[PDB]
């Protein structure tokens, strides 16, 4: 508490602490809409995960 | 429900080959997938033997367990979706066109998870794919939907 570390936790979760990048965003959760998720993280990147 | 399907019953007497109206828990996997199911063979296998059921010795059937079984892997039905298979071969080779190259569907089909024969994978392979080498997966699960 007194080092910072907590505060810093704290901060983050105002922000946007995890931050998935896309592929590793499409492999892990395609599955979920599996047809849809996976056209998308196919079709771009990006726009997949979108 | 009747909508009583009574043409279930005549399926059976085509499918038991002594005719004393009883079909072998073996052939109750193949004859539920003939009368418009498509129940995964671990699913089948579980269900018997979550009841107990061995299909390990011999075994008879009656109607009146084959009839109850049939509707309990009729609500199943709702995981057949035809964007799923379609996707998943369209992650399994490069480029924008739906060809799989004839040896890794049939090395896929025979040995990745539940094993299908290396004669049922060249029965369906023949025809959909020509002397190319290339599997076109969007006609070739078209005509596997339509049985």
Redesign the interface.
């Known amino acids: 508490r007194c080092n910072g570390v907590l505060e810093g936790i704290r901060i983050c979760r105002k922000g946007f602490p995890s931050r998935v990048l896309y592929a590793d965003f499409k492999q892990r959760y395609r599955v979920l809409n599996a047809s849809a998720i996976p056209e998308g993280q196919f079709m771009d990147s990006k726009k997949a995960s979108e | 429900s009747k909508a009583a399907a009574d043409d279930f019953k005549e399926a059976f007497l085509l499918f038991d080959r002594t005719g004393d109206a009883k079909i072998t828990a073996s052939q109750v996997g193949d004859i539920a997938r003939a009368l418009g199911q498509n129940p995964t063979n671990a699913e089948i296998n579980k269900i018997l033997g979550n009841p107990s059921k061995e299909e390990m010795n011999a075994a008879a059937i009656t109607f009146e367990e084959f009839l109850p079984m049939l509707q309990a892997a009729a609500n199943n039905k709702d995981q057949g ?1 035809f ?2 298979f379609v ?1 998943g071969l ?2 399994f080779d490069k480029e924008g066109n739906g060809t799989v190259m004839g040896a890794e569907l049939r090395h896929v089909l025979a040995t990745l998870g539940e094993k299908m024969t290396e004669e049922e994978v060249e029965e369906l392979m023949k025809g959909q794919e020509d002397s190319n080498g290339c599997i076109n997966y969007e006609a070739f699960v078209k005509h596997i939907m339509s049985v």
Request: glycine share 0%.
């Open positions: 979706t964007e799923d996707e369209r992650v």
